[PDB]
């Protein structure tokens, strides 16, 4: 079974450096080309670089030439992307792949920004007092003012999954993200069941459980 696993992504300042790794399993990178390909928000897929690990020959996209270096260590069956002079435009999910490109890794997120990490505030969206009796009610959580993405949300520590919608984050004018997670439940349950949204913002090590009460 062929596998490729990327690591090393994270949040870095413009002008900074970051090294990604691509660990290969189930084949030897000596036998192939290894590529990096990235996906920036709304820019589709863009090839970044390639290497032939046997002789170390490399090729680069014009937009990264000079300031990125792709390399490989055949004795570790691992390839690398050294990224320097980073720009906001470099913010993307970075994938490695091999030679058509028949196998790809899961990707690693690189965010290039001068903004600091900030954990969210979490506020309840309380079910309406005019909820239709015996019908359907909606409630939710507002996960506000965090940076960078991503955040995850569950309900009742994962026990509640039906009727849950967790929305794409929106970027506010402040440069901070805001997102909503909602769930629809029966109206007859509002006075008898507890609803708690579990918010995790790993980039800031923030975990918040917020009870949403009628």
């Amino acid at each position: 079974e062929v596998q490729l696993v990327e690591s090393g992504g994270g949040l870095v300042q413009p002008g900074g450096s970051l090294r990604l790794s691509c660990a290969a399993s189930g084949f030897n990178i000596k036998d192939t080309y290894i590529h990096w390909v990235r996906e920036a928000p709304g820019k589709g897929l863009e090839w970044v670089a390639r290497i032939y690990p046997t002789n170390g020959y490399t090729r680069y996209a014009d937009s990264v030439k000079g300031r990125f270096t792709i390399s490989a260590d055949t004795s570790k069956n691992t390839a690398y992307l050294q990224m320097n002079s980073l720009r906001a435009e470099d913010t993307a999910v970075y994938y490695c792949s091999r030679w058509a490109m028949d196998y790809w890794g899961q990707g690693t997120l690189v965010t290039v920004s001068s903004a600091s990490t900030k954990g969210p505030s979490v506020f309840p969206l309380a079910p309406s007092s005019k909820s239709t009796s015996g019908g359907t009610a909606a409630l939710g959580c507002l996960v506000k003012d965090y940076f960078p993405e991503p955040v995850t949300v569950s309900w009742n520590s994962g026990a509640l999954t039906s009727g849950v919608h967790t929305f794409p984050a929106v970027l506010q004018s402040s440069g901070l993200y805001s997102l909503k997670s909602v769930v629809t439940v029966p109206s007859s349950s509002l006075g008898t069941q507890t609803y708690i949204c579990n918010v995790n913002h790993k980039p800031s090590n923030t975990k918040v459980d917020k009870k949403v009460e009628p």
């Binding site: 897929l45 090839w47 996209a61 007092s129 919608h165 929305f167």
Partner: protein, 213 residues
């Protein structure tokens, strides 16, 4: 060498024949591949060298070449086939990708259920006010939210986002925030979300009175 992919999206039903095209800006011989991509997932190779089926890929997938034009066909669309598809030329360096084609599932019209939420006392205490509107489980995707404050139409101060198609009923949901300073929020009484959608015989409005339990 650029790859011009059309359409950007299409909706189809299980069993349909689907056609996605890609035009290379120059000759690329048969050096074209097609990929499938699902959200949060790695791209998957479908077709290599224009027409060859990648091992393990279902027989319903095929590729064709006519000159500079490349065609991906799905003979009978299956439930697991709903995803985004990309063409790629690798005739020269750099290899380049089309902008992708998002394949979504057609279903019946469903009206949204609409809900409105005041800012929480907690957020107000912190000094800001987010007014929330939810449009739940509707189809098709096209929908319009109109915010009104004391019956005055709002524009410019809201942001919305939409989920991908639900894995069980194939609907969309939409979430909209009207953002106001606490000071401005408290200058007005009635907050309303008015929703227009094909499933609704006439627009639906949900509203609240500021301060009412």
């Amino acid at each position: 060498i650029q790859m011009t992919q059309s359409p950007s999206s299409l909706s189809a039903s299980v069993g349909d024949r689907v056609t996605i095209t890609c035009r290379a800006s120059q000759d690329v011989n048969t050096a074209v591949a097609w990929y499938q991509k699902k959200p949060g997932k790695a791209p998957k190779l479908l077709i290599y060298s224009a027409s060859f089926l990648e091992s393990g890929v279902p027989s319903r997938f095929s590729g064709s070449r006519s000159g500079t034009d490349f065609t991906l066909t799905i003979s009978s669309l299956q439930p697991e086939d709903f995803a985004t598809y990309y063409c790629q030329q690798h005739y020269t360096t750099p290899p380049t990708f089309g902008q992708g084609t998002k394949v979504e599932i057609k279903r019946t019209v469903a009206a949204p259920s609409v809900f409105i939420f005041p800012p929480s006392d907690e957020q107000l205490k912190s000094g800001t006010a987010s007014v929330e509107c939810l449009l739940n489980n509707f189809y098709p995707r096209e929908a319009k939210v109109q915010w009104k404050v004391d019956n005055a139409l709002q524009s410019g101060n809201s942001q919305e986002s939409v989920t991908e198609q639900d894995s069980k009923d194939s609907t969309y949901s939409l979430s909209s925030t009207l953002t106001l300073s606490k000071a401005d929020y408290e200058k007005h009484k009635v907050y309303a979300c008015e929703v227009t959608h094909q499933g609704l015989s006439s627009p639906v409005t949900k509203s609240f009175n500021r301060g009412e339990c």
